[PDB]
């Protein structure tokens, strides 16, 4: 009955752990021991964007590295020009509780979702010049935590009902569902090739999904509490996770285990967002103590602090040319650092 | 093209300044516990009530997006200890630590609460009612620091007078917040 199956599961877990231990030839610290340190990383706020009434929950850069979308829980989706601080669009939402937003890689569409369990797709390049709701995707049984456009016709969403999904915007139907998590899925991150992606959930685990076949290939368990953010390394062979135990961790897909832990004795708040700089040498992480930190991903030593916000930092992003960082916060201001 | 961008920014800003007026003059309420949006207006002031019935049973992630709401309406009828524990976890949350609670005791006994044998307020039903109210108030008045309070009520009828009560406690909440900001309370 259940006893034999659970014994088999424990045996398989032990075998997996032993196989992983057989590969621990050395540590990342011993290999990057003789590497020149980054030094001190100092950044200055170039622009401050002020148009939101309530706290900001998400932001996302465009592929041209100039325009960016942001979502606020007053019911607003604002598109900004970051160079000139202008406003391009301001879109009102039917539901004021929006937890995520995304930008199409072509720049023609925008998506959002939240406590309404629905993903809304808006057409920016309207024939009439007016941003109108192109599509509403409704098949989740819990609030949406993340969404990421694969192209103009496909989108991956993650929900609080412990599932991920791939959609078809032309027909508005789910194509495949990714179901292995036992807690809310909090974040997802697409690969550079958009053939796989990773998800982090509230069971303190992360899972690698194959988009085309709709299965789970690897599971990574190093954290001790809920995982809030996840990001992919520039070459797509590693990823970084930040959680509620006040640590970040770096995992390797090919070695199938955790490599580095970025933690400090004076940090006792959770990480709300993570991102990687252009070369993968810096790891940007936002926290609940209102400021972000910069970590030397190869040496796990703090190299700088981004202290400019008066409330909890919710979002964090780096441009595709690597020339600016945008951070939003619960005090309703976005800031751009260089 | 800079002129056109400046003009578009002007239109956006003009609409935003008009939307901010409507946003700030409205009071948003959460209705967890028991019984989606509902817009109702009492004495020329608009209220906006939300009910979150379509989600799962894990509350610790979507509850912290209600940290700017004016008040939380908690309807509570061992089903009592679960409501007490939910209230105790809401009260001590890091993000809901300045939110007031309007408590509706919808019901209107020593085996599950042994402290009842030595509690002094038919008078028996009033003793029971005030025992339950005192349990909730003993949780609330222990870790407040003065930034939020609890307003308990007894509700059993067709609820002809349940809308004026929320009005009255939402007025008291703001009056106390302003009096405390002016160093007067």
């Amino acid at each position, epitope marked *: 009955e259940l006893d034999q199956l659970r014994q088999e599961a424990e045996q398989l877990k032990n075998q997996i752990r032993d196989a992983r231990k057989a590969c621990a030839d050395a540590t990342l610290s011993q290999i990057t021991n003789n590497i020149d340190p980054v030094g001190r990383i100092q950044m200055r706020t170039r622009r401050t964007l002020r148009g939101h009434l309530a706290k900001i929950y998400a932001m996302h850069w465009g592929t041209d590295s100039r325009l960016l979308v942001s979502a606020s829980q007053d019911g607003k989706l604002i598109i900004w020009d970051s160079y000139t601080t202008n406003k391009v669009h301001a879109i009102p939402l039917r539901s004021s509780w929006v937890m995520t937003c995304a930008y199409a890689p072509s720049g023609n569409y925008v998506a959002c979702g939240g406590l309404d369990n629905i993903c809304s797709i808006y057409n920016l390049k309207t024939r009439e010049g007016n941003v109108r709701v192109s599509r509403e995707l409704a098949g989740h049984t819990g609030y949406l935590s993340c969404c990421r456009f694969l192209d103009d016709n496909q989108i991956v969403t993650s929900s609080g009902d412990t599932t991920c999904a791939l959609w078809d915007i032309e027909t508005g139907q789910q194509t495949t569902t990714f179901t292995g998590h036992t807690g809310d899925v909090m974040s997802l991150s697409l690969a550079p090739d958009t053939r796989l992606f990773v998800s982090g959930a509230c069971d303190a685990s992360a899972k690698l999904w194959d988009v085309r076949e709709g299965m789970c290939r690897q599971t990574f368990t190093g954290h001790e509490s809920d995982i809030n953010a996840i990001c992919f390394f520039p070459n797509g062979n590693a990823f970084a996770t930040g959680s509620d135990d006040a640590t970040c961790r770096l995992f390797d897909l090919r070695a199938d285990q955790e490599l580095m832990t970025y933690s400090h004795d004076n940090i006792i708040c959770g990480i709300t967002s993570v991102s990687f700089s252009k070369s993968g040498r810096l790891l940007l992480a936002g926290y609940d103590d209102f400021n972000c930190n910069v970590w030397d991903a190869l040496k796990a030593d703090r190299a700088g602090v981004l202290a400019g916000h008066d409330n909890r930092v919710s979002c964090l992003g780096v441009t595709d040319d690597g020339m600016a960082v945008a951070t939003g916060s619960w005090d309703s201001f976005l800031k751009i650092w260089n | 093209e800079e002129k056109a961008q400046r003009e578009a920014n002007k239109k956006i800003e003009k609409q935003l300044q008009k939307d901010k007026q409507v946003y700030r003059a409205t009071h948003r309420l959460l209705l967890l516990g028991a019984g989606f949006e509902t817009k109702f207006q009492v004495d020329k002031v608009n209220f906006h009530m939300f009910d979150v019935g379509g989600q799962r*049973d894990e509350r610790r992630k979507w509850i912290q997006c209600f940290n700017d709401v004016t008040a939380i309406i908690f309807v509570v009828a061992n089903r009592l200890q679960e409501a007490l524990n939910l209230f105790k*976890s809401i009260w001590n949350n890091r993000w809901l630590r300045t939110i007031s609670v309007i408590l509706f005791l919808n019901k209107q006994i020593e085996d599950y609460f042994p402290e009842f044998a030595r509690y002094t307020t038919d008078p028996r039903v009033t003793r029971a009612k005030y025992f339950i109210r005192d349990e909730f108030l003993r949780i609330s008045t222990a870790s407040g620091d003065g930034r939020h309070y609890c307003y308990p009520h007894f509700t059993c009828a067709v609820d002809t007078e349940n809308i004026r009560r929320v009005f009255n406690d939402c007025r008291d909440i703001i009056q106390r917040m302003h009096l405390r900001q002016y160093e007067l309370l």
Partner: nanobody
Amino acid sequence: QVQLQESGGGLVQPGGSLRLSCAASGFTFSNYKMNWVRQAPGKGLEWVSDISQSGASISYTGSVKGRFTISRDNAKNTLYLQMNSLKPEDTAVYYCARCPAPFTRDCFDVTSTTYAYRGQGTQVTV
């Protein structure tokens, strides 16, 4: 990986004494609050007891107040429940549950249908 494993229990006559134990691994035991939860045959999960990070604060449900005792050994990373003067009502599955996050004062979601940081439980028949 967060693992909690419970031991102790079985069949006892009314008035007997048992000592449930819960051994935890995969996390820092002393940063978290710990709880005892039970599921009776026929009803839902019910909260029994809780103990804080150091053991100074202790709370019991009404029906067990006076005849159950919770304690934690942080050096050995283990949690206990001493149950004496048992009743036929006390028969249930007993789980050892953990707070979602460290250093916090609130314990959300511990008695949910599908919770991630609680053990598999042990049966107690009286």
